């Protein structure tokens, strides 16, 4: 419904709150009745389109490499670490970080668990190959940025319900917490 001061702007006259409520009540009464096209347009003159906004997690498109394999690329950032991951549709669960195996690149088990989180959450461990590149930051920031990039790239190969579940699990949100 139109706000009071916008209704004032259009009517070019100051009006109180009670008379605004009276006008809105009349408009609601008009809507309740079988309003025709003219009446629908008249009410639409007073109806603004702001309400409601849907968080749907724009999916990345599927690219195809020279060998004919399907892959999707995505980016992520955590503190000063920036990562870009390429997730292939089919694989055996091989993750390569800067050309290095993930267990060699990430000695600490916490980082490996963070990298495991996206694929485990959707029960497709051992079904995709990842080739990522991370720069800047430290150990944990790099692990988190890779986690985010992999989740966003993986969103291409799951159902929309699984995309929304990943979003509700925090797997698709950029962590904005940074030093002062």
């Amino acid at each position: 419904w139109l706000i009071k001061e916008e209704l004032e702007e259009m009517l070019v006259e100051k009006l109180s709150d009670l008379d605004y409520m009276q006008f809105i009540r009349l408009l609601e009464k008009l809507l309740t009745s079988q309003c025709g096209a003219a009446e629908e347009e008249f009410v639409q003159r007073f109806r603004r389109s702001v309400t409601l906004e849907s968080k749907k997690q724009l999916i990345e498109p599927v690219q195809y490499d020279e060998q004919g394999m399907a892959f999707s690329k995505s980016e992520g950032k955590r503190k000063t670490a920036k990562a870009e991951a390429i997730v292939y549709k089919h694989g055996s669960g091989r993750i390569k970080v800067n050309g290095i195996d993930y267990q060699l690149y990430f000695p600490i088990t916490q980082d490996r668990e963070q990298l495991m989180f996206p694929f485990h959450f959707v029960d497709r461990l051992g079904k995709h190959d990842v080739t990522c590149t991370v720069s800047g930051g430290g150990r944990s920031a790099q692990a988190g940025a890779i986690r985010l990039a992999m989740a966003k790239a993986l969103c291409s190969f799951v159902t929309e319900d699984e995309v929304e579940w990943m979003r509700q699990a925090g797997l698709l949100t950029t962590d904005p917490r940074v030093r002062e």
Partner: peptide
């Protein structure tokens, strides 16, 4: 077993 496989990457020591 799948989580152990991922977390070790089949490395005997890990």
């Amino acid at each position: 077993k799948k989580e152990l496989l991922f977390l070790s990457n089949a490395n005997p020591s890990l």
